[PDB]
Amino acid sequence: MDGSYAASYLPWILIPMVGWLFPAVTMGLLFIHIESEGEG
Amino acid sequence: MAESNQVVQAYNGDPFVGHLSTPISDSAFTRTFIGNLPAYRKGLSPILRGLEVGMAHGYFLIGPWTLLGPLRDSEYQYIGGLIGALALILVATAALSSYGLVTFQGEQGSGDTLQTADGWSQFAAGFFVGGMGGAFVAYFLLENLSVVDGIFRGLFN
Amino acid sequence: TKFPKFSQDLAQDPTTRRIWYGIATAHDFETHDGMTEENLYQKIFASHFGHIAIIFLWTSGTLFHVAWQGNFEQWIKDPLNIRPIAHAIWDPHFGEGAVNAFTQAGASNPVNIAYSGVYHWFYTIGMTTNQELYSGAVFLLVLASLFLFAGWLHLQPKFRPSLAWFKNAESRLNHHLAGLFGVSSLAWAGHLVHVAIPEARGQHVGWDNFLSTPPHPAGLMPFFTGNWGVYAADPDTAGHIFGTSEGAGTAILTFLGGFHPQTESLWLTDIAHHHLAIAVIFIIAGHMYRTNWGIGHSIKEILNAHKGPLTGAGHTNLYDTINNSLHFQLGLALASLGVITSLVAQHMYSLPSYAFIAQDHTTQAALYTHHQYIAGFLMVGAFAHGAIFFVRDYDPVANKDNVLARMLEHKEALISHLSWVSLFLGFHTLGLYVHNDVVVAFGTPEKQILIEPVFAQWIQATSGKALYGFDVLLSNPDSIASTTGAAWLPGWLDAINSGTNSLFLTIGPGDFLVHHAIALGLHTTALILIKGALDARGSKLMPDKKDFGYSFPCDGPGRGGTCDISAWDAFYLAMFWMLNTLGWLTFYWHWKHLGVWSGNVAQFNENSTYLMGWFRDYLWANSAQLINGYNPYGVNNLSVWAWMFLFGHLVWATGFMFLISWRGYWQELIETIVWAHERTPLANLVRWKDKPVALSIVQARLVGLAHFTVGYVLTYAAFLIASTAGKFG
Amino acid sequence: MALSDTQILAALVVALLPAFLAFRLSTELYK
Amino acid sequence: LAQASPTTAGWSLSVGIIMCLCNVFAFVIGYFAIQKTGKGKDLALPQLASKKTFGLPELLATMSFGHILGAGMVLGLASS
Numbered sequence A: 001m002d003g004s005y006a007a008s009y010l011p012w013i014l015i016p017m018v019g020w021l022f023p024a025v026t027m028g029l030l031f032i033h034i035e036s037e038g039e040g
Numbered sequence B: 001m002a003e004s005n006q007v008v009q010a011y012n013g014d015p016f017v018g019h020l021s022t023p024i025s026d027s028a029f030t031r032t033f034i035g036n037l038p039a040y041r042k043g044l045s046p047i048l049r050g051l052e053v054g055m056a057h058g059y060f061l062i063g064p065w066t067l068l069g070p071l072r073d074s075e076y077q078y079i080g081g082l083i084g085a086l087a088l089i090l091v092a093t094a095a096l097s098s099y100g101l102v103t104f105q106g107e108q109g110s111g112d113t114l115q116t117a118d119g120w121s122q123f124a125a126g127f128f129v130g131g132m133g134g135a136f137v138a139y140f141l142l143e144n145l146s147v148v149d150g151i152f153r154g155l156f157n
Numbered sequence C: 001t002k003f004p005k006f007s008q009d010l011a012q013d014p015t016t017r018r019i020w021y022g023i024a025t026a027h028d029f030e031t032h033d034g035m036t037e038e039n040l041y042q043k044i045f046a047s048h049f050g051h052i053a054i055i056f057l058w059t060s061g062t063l064f065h066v067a068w069q070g071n072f073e074q075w076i077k078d079p080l081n082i083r084p085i086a087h088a089i090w091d092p093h094f095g096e097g098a099v100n101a102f103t104q105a106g107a108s109n110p111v112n113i114a115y116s117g118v119y120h121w122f123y124t125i126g127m128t129t130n131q132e133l134y135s136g137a138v139f140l141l142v143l144a145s146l147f148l149f150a151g152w153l154h155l156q157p158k159f160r161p162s163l164a165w166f167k168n169a170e171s172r173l174n175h176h177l178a179g180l181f182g183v184s185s186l187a188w189a190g191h192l193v194h195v196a197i198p199e200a201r202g203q204h205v206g207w208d209n210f211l212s213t214p215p216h217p218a219g220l221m222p223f224f225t226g227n228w229g230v231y232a233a234d235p236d237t238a239g240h241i242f243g244t245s246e247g248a249g250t251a252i253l254t255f256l257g258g259f260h261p262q263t264e265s266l267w268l269t270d271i272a273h274h275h276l277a278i279a280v281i282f283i284i285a286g287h288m289y290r291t292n293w294g295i296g297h298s299i300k301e302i303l304n305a306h307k308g309p310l311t312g313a314g315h316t317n318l319y320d321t322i323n324n325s326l327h328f329q330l331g332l333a334l335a336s337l338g339v340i341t342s343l344v345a346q347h348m349y350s351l352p353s354y355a356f357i358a359q360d361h362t363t364q365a366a367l368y369t370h371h372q373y374i375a376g377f378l379m380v381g382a383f384a385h386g387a388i389f390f391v392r393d394y395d396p397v398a399n400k401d402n403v404l405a406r407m408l409e410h411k412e413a414l415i416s417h418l419s420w421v422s423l424f425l426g427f428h429t430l431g432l433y434v435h436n437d438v439v440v441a442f443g444t445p446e447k448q449i450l451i452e453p454v455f456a457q458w459i460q461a462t463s464g465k466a467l468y469g470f471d472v473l474l475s476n477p478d479s480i481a482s483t484t485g486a487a488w489l490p491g492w493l494d495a496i497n498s499g500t501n502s503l504f505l506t507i508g509p510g511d512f513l514v515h516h517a518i519a520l521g522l523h524t525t526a527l528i529l530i531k532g533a534l535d536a537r538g539s540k541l542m543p544d545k546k547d548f549g550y551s552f553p554c555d556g557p558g559r560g561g562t563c564d565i566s567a568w569d570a571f572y573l574a575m576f577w578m579l580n581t582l583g584w585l586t587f588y589w590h591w592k593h594l595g596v597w598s599g600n601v602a603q604f605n606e607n608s609t610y611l612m613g614w615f616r617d618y619l620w621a622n623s624a625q626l627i628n629g630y631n632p633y634g635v636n637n638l639s640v641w642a643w644m645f646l647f648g649h650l651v652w653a654t655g656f657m658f659l660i661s662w663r664g665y666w667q668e669l670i671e672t673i674v675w676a677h678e679r680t681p682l683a684n685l686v687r688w689k690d691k692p693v694a695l696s697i698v699q700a701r702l703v704g705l706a707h708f709t710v711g712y713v714l715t716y717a718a719f720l721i722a723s724t725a726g727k728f729g
Numbered sequence D: 001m002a003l004s005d006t007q008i009l010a011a012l013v014v015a016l017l018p019a020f021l022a023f024r025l026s027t028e029l030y031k
Numbered sequence E: 001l002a003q004a005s006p007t008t009a010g011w012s013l014s015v016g017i018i019m020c021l022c023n024v025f026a027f028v029i030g031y032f033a034i035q036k037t038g039k040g041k042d043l044a045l046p047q048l049a050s051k052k053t054f055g056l057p058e059l060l061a062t063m064s065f066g067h068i069l070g071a072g073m074v075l076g077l078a079s080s
């Protein structure tokens, strides 16, 4: 896995960020949100 | 509706408290974001708060000396960064502990379990363990940057 | 709990169902707690702004990835021998074999090849460099920002539009016809005349010079005088070579029909002229309705004035019926848009407009299938929202005796005659197919009932197709329809009479049989959808069904049993028939064009008559390459398509589970699992925040249909793409 | 010619604007 | 010599087709946009249709604006 396009170091960290960090964080936020029992 | 399209208001409804309710100071996003950081997240024990803060700080403190320290152009680049970050986290722990020792000499409060001698000491313990751990794991990842690169590129399968 | 905040009922649900239904009813704003009509329209307006912005950001991503990781500038040089690439691959899962297999199309890193035809589009409209695509994508970033901010602003009280503003149909129709449709088409004709057409002739026109280089040497003088023919000028010669001035003309507005000889697409000057004419007509039409100056029509008066002796009340109050029902409006929009989306699909493959896209067979197949599937979804949604109208918004007293109510009055006749036409078509098309199958099986293929589609061939002749020798209208030189001197007639005839394109493809008995299969599919899907819409208010099994809403599980096992009684269930059943219809039509298109591109039309002509020919010569054979994307011997660039083929089979079969096996069995199993958890130590330390329950009945139908459809679409897409790419037409 | 690193990074900064506006529209539509 | 090309006194295209047309356009948007049209020191009496319709200052200002518009448009349409 490489890339000859400009700034080919961006998928290197963006693919883990989009596949691991983004889903983990958004699922965690939505999880704490749908389980929130604050009245209302 | 009405006439208040205004985005700035008196802070907490008291205009004579020296503060203002602004999009940076008191928007819903900042209330939820600051209020859920380890320092303020509800119900947490101070040990976990300290652990999380220390993880973040120890992890990121390895970088400055790793890329810009005196050993950056030597065979001990990442070890130099690690040594620096560890010593810095040790000094920071001593600062945190001295703070706790001096500010909680009298009667202990009740509303804030972090704002007590026991709570601030637990915070310092968690911060020490998390800072040392984060610094050492950042160092370990950097010292084996080639295997992380091959992992992220699939150079091993 | 808080979530969902728009429903107290769901918010107090103590099971996991609360979550599911909270996801499933978010966009149904009308049934939110405390919802008013004005707040409804305002929320819809802001949601619309958000959706437009999402579209713009998607287009920005397409432009950006072509410009950053693609081969646009290289593909422009040799567009018939270079494969356009969509974006770079970055997957840490890849091994050496896949890395090698996907460094393709001249790329120096793993890459996917594009099948959206977007290279041909951007090149035809005058873009030639990556810098232009990047500037376009940044501009679309800005446009999306503008629409997002506007959506936010129109939720602010001072900028909140009133209900009467949303209900001003006359002004909005005027603006959308004259401005949204008309001035946009005018501006596009201006881009064509200013940029795309000069670019196609070797000239550069961009923001650096477009002020000081006219589209025509005469420039505006003939326009404001008589003398419009100057712009028809000398057109591009037959020897014109796209992108260069060799054989290039100077005209900007022509009407010579046919295709460009080299690019096999409509002439850019014809397209510019079309957009100018359409602009004129739409601008004129955008003055029909009354707004602020007394002149103009009231739609209400037009509808009220159209009554007959045989239609009762006519169209009386239809203005309020439609203006007060967002579901009526949405059903109309969906039906019309689905019709014209099918129209787009039928005309782009037949009369392409982008240079060299006709020789790109995988893109043609993919775009046709894409637009046809979009059309099918749009049609089903149109009828579903008609049913929702009847359930939620239909008023019997105001619509009394008009055409709308009269459609309900004789609904049994409509439903029964739809049943009869479906039975007619099914019985006899299946019978002819099975007769042909048996007769070819026993080694006597000469006994096939082969009906020549004489009517469609005769229509082709009326447009000029001389192959059949009908000699009618444009196929007869003596015809008054052909002795007009129409400037388009020579080019149109030259295009339609060469067997080298997809302009009115020659047809035979196979086309007859598949067209009746298509008629059966359309009629049966329409029958399901219309029976659901007309019985949504009530039948004899459920004379009070309107009290139960559009979607509900059932009415219980009593009164004979009432599984799938709601009109939502009619939508859900009709989805299967839509997918079946689109399977038939895309099989037809793909196999016929496989023959066309391969030159071997005899295969489809002689084997599309019996269904075993469809089984082996279309499905079984064209899988060979696709299925060998990965094997014990190695891997090629078809590996993704093989794995996606299997993935779709799996998702489809998985949906079978929700469709076939119903709910109570799962609730009992989940109760055993709940007991197993509550009694397993260490695991006992943890407890669920929501009580686990089986998926609801409607939820089951929907989830099973979703798996069915995902698997359907992905399976066929992988097959189509991999077969056409491995064979290369 | 080929896009530059500066052009790629400049587009991400620009995209920060639709991100903030989409966040604002989302949170307001939640109201 | 690299100089933007203007036009010699066309006196068919340069006049009414641009200059007088831009002046009429300025007339129109001033008629529909000036808050105080006839509140000038100078009445310049006979209120008419457009040429000298509301006030001397309205006339003079909208005419100066029409000349700005016409200068810009003539120069632009003649290259730059």
Ligand code: CLA
Binding pocket: C211, E004, E068, E069, E070, E071, E072, E073, E075, E076, E077, E079, E080
């Ligand atoms: C059909 C009408 C028409 C046509 C098409 C043209 C055509 C043209 N005009 Mg003209 N113009 C017109 C009407 C027209 N004009 C009218 C009615 C006026 C009167 C206001 C003008 C006055 C005008 C001037 C003064 C100039 C032109 C210029 C030009 C040329 C500009 C080339 C260019 O890209 O600019 C440049 C492109 C840019 C992106 C530059 C923008 C960057 C600036 C410097 C930012 C500055 C910000 C500023 C300080 C903020 C304003 C302060 C506050 C008021 C907000 C062009 C061929 C220029 C010219 O003739 O060139 C020789 C020029 O100097 N026009």
Ligand code: CLA
Binding pocket: A010, A011, A012, A014, A015, A018, C054, C057, C058, C059, C060, C061, C062, C064, C087, C088, C089, C090, C137, D008, D011, D012, D013, D015
């Ligand atoms: C909606 C359009 C769109 C789509 C579908 C993609 C798709 C992809 N991009 Mg790209 N990107 C886009 C727009 C888009 N991009 C734009 C406009 C830019 C310039 C700002 C970039 C800059 C960018 C970089 C630098 C990289 C990718 C990469 C990738 C790939 C991995 C995913 C990723 O890391 O993205 C990350 C995306 C960003 C950091 C920027 C956000 C993209 C836009 C602005 C937001 C899209 C929001 C969307 C419309 C919300 C709707 C979602 C819907 C389900 C509700 C993936 C195939 C990686 C790649 O090339 O793989 C090899 C890579 O490293 N993108």
Ligand code: CLA
Binding pocket: A013, A016, A017, A020, A021, A024, B059, B060, B062, B063, B064, B066, B067, B068, B138, B141, B142, B145, B148
């Ligand atoms: C003088 C200022 C300065 C300097 C010079 C550095 C220097 C450095 N930083 Mg730092 N940083 C700074 C300030 C600074 N930082 C500040 C102010 C912050 C905000 C508080 C950060 C926060 C930050 C973070 C969060 C990270 C760095 C990292 C780095 C290193 C990355 C460069 C590299 O070697 O490539 C190589 C980079 C990597 C191999 C990173 C690995 C890929 C990570 C894990 C992303 C994948 C996310 C994924 C979801 C995690 C999976 C776990 C789980 C959730 C599934 C580098 C030595 C990275 C690092 O320490 O590397 C270990 C890192 O992760 N910086």
Ligand code: CLA
Binding pocket: B090, B091, B093, B094, B095, B097, B098, B128
């Ligand atoms: C011989 C007795 C003794 C020994 C073995 C230690 C050992 C240790 N102490 Mg402690 N300490 C002591 C007495 C002692 N302490 C007393 C009497 C006090 C009250 C004033 C403290 C208050 C203190 C604080 C507030 C902290 C420590 C901490 C630590 C650890 C960090 C390493 C270090 O500070 O360097 C070795 C130290 C010595 C060889 C000298 C020990 C005797 C002096 C008087 C200690 C003075 C503490 C000083 C303010 C903090 C040092 C700063 C740091 C940068 C080294 C370490 C294992 C830190 C820690 O991580 O705790 C969890 C920290 O936060 N100590």
Ligand code: CLA
Binding pocket: C044, C045, C048, C049, C052, C165, C166, C168, C171, C172, C175, C176, C178, C179, C180, C181, C184
């Ligand atoms: C000239 C003034 C004008 C214009 C430009 C618009 C424009 C628009 N309005 Mg608006 N409107 C106006 C006046 C105007 N309006 C007035 C005065 C009122 C009050 C009476 C309204 C009230 C109103 C409401 C309440 C709403 C809109 C909405 C919309 C948007 C419709 C959705 C859309 O984006 O489809 C764009 C459509 C086209 C570009 C043309 C249709 C294309 C046809 C169908 C076929 C395609 C042709 C061609 C083959 C395409 C090529 C394909 C390409 C990929 C190659 C649209 C951008 C809706 C919206 O989304 O809000 C944000 C909405 O909710 N309008």
Ligand code: CLA
Binding pocket: C023, C024, C025, C026, C027, C028, C029, C330, C334, C377, C378, C380, C381, C382, C384, C385, C388, C550, C551, C568, C571, C706, C710
């Ligand atoms: C184009 C305009 C349009 C508009 C704005 C609406 C608007 C609406 N519809 Mg409608 N409808 C439309 C088109 C439209 N629809 C179409 C095209 C169809 C045919 C499919 C339908 C059929 C229909 C029915 C039968 C119903 C509605 C309903 C509704 C309402 C509730 C929406 C909701 O919350 O559901 C939220 C939606 C979901 C939770 C499901 C999302 C499914 C996603 C997009 C597909 C998943 C794909 C999968 C994950 C892909 C995996 C890929 C991977 C394997 C590689 C809402 C007001 C419902 C209603 O309330 O009735 C009044 C209702 O019962 N619609």
Ligand code: CLA
Binding pocket: C418, C419, C420, C422, C423, C424, C425, C426, C427, C428, C430, C524, C527, C528, C573, C574, C576, C577
């Ligand atoms: C290959 C599978 C298949 C077949 C053959 C049918 C058949 C039919 N469906 Mg159906 N459907 C299917 C799958 C299928 N469906 C699926 C998966 C769904 C989603 C659940 C639906 C949901 C559905 C709905 C909602 C509706 C239909 C309708 C119909 C009828 C339409 C009229 C017609 O086709 O003309 C004529 C019929 C036929 C050609 C089929 C009969 C074929 C036999 C072989 C004829 C000979 C009789 C035979 C010799 C009997 C002797 C038996 C003996 C030897 C043991 C038809 C009987 C519509 C309807 O009822 O029409 C009024 C309707 O409303 N279908």
Ligand SMILES: CCCCCCCCCCCCCCCC(=O)OC[C@H](COP(=O)(O)OC[C@@H](O)CO)OC(=O)CCCCCCCCCCCCCCC
Binding pocket: C306, C307, C308, C309, C310, C311, C314, C315, C403
């Ligand atoms: C391809 C085959 C299509 C299959 C469709 C179904 C076939 C069954 C035949 C339907 C008979 C319906 C009986 C009506 C009952 C009936 O006779 O009512 C009597 C009605 C007389 O009412 P009036 O016209 O006086 O009413 C005045 C109007 O303002 C209100 O309708 O006559 C008609 O409506 C003739 C039109 C019926 C045909 C329906 C139109 C179908 C296609 C429309 C094409 C539109 C083209 C527009 C282009 C400008």
Ligand SMILES: CC1=C(/C=C/C(C)=C\C=C\C(C)=C\C=C\C=C(C)\C=C/C=C(C)/C=C/C2=C(C)C(=O)CCC2(C)C)C(C)(C)CCC1
Binding pocket: C059, C063, C132, C133, C135, C136, C137, C139, C140, C187
């Ligand atoms: C003074 C004035 C006039 C002179 C006007 C002059 C002198 C110039 C006007 C130029 C204009 C009005 C340019 C308009 C450009 C509009 C565009 C460019 C609109 C939309 C672009 C979109 C929506 C996105 C397109 C996409 C992009 C970005 C891509 O890169 C891929 C394709 C696609 C996705 C389509 C005249 C005398 C005439 C009338 C009197 C007033």
Ligand SMILES: CC1=C(/C=C/C(C)=C/C=C/C(C)=C/C=C/C=C(C)/C=C/C=C(C)/C=C/C2=C(C)CCCC2(C)C)C(C)(C)CCC1
Binding pocket: B055, B056, B057, B059, B060, B129, B130, B132, B133, B134, B135, B136, B137
């Ligand atoms: C983007 C953004 C932002 C920012 C952010 C930041 C600035 C951050 C950074 C981040 C970080 C900074 C992170 C981190 C991470 C860390 C970690 C993850 C850690 C760790 C550690 C460990 C794991 C350790 C371990 C251990 C121990 C503990 C002991 C023994 C030894 C060892 C090492 C094993 C915000 C949201 C604001 C806003 C928006 C945008």
Ligand SMILES: CC1=C(/C=C/C(C)=C/C=C/C(C)=C/C=C/C=C(C)/C=C/C=C(C)/C=C/C2=C(C)CCCC2(C)C)C(C)(C)CCC1
Binding pocket: C327, C328, C329, C331, C332, C335, C339, C379, C382, C383, C385, C386, C387, C389, C390, C533
């Ligand atoms: C349920 C419902 C509904 C409905 C829905 C839907 C979905 C509908 C539809 C429908 C459809 C989907 C239709 C279609 C159609 C078509 C047509 C009507 C056509 C026409 C045509 C013509 C007329 C043509 C002609 C021609 C030709 C053929 C060729 C040459 C040229 C010419 C032009 C001559 C609503 C909501 C409304 C209401 C409520 C209920």
Ligand code: SF4
Binding pocket: C553, C554, C555, C556, C557, C561, C562, C563, C564, C662, C697
């Ligand atoms: S089987 Fe299910 S859907 Fe049918 S009646 Fe019983 S509960 Fe209702």
Ligand SMILES: [Ca+2]
Binding pocket: C126, C128, C199, C203, C204, C205, C206
């Ligand atoms: Ca150019």
Ligand SMILES: [Mg+2]
Binding pocket: C347, C348, C351, C352, C353, C354
């Ligand atoms: Mg076309």
